[PDB]
Amino acid sequence: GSHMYLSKQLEFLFYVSSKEIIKKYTNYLKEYDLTYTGYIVLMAIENDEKLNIKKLGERVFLDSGTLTPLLKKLEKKDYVVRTREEKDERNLQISLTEQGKAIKSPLAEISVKVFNEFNISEREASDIINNLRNFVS
């Protein structure tokens, strides 16, 4: 009732919620040699798209400290291509490779599998969506 108690409950429940979700993603993704964050990046890059490391970090809310080594990892696995620009070799363009393009869409099956494990009704899921949408406004 006090905002102190509600805030501690919100803190706890958002933390555990997101961590339980991520743990399930990590389990499904391990056989793809992917982390949850690597998954998020591949899904965020739109297939015919070329984009800057800074624009990608904004879309996905990661700083260059995290993205940079992640991209090299993805580049090693041949899911992303990191092409240095002609004039400024510092500046990098990021795009999906052919297999990076392909493994999206088996990866697109994973979200259904993760959330079905929580066994909530469509109604409960719609309530959570409406809760969180209003929350993110």
Interaction of residue 136 with a copy of itself, rule CB under 8 A: yes
CA distances in angstroms from 13 to 20, 22, 83, 96, 135, listed in the order given: 10, 14, 41, 35, 14
Interaction of residue 99 with a copy of itself, rule CB under 8 A: no
How far is it, in rounded angstroms, from Cα 44 to Cα 33? 18
How far is it, in rounded angstroms, from Cα 21 to Cα 115? 8
Interaction of residue 30 with a copy of itself, rule CB under 8 A: no
Nearer to a copy of itself, 82 or 101 (CB): 101
Chain Cα centroid distance, residue 34? 11
Per-residue binding letters, 105-134, with a copy of itself (x by CB under 8 A) = ------xx-xxx-xxx-x-xxxxxx-xxxx
CB 125 within 8 A of CB 115: yes
Contact region for a copy of itself (CB under 8 A) — 21-29, 48-56, 69-77, 87-95?
21-29
Interaction of residue 102 with a copy of itself, rule CB under 8 A: no
Q: Sign of the CA dihedral 67, 68, 71, 72?
A: negative
Interaction of residue 50 with a copy of itself, rule CB under 8 A: no
Nearer to a copy of itself, 32 or 115 (CB): 115
Question: Which residues form the interface with a copy of itself (CB under 8 A)?
Answer: 1-4, 6-11, 13-23, 40, 61, 111-112, 114-116, 118-120, 122, 124-129, 131-136
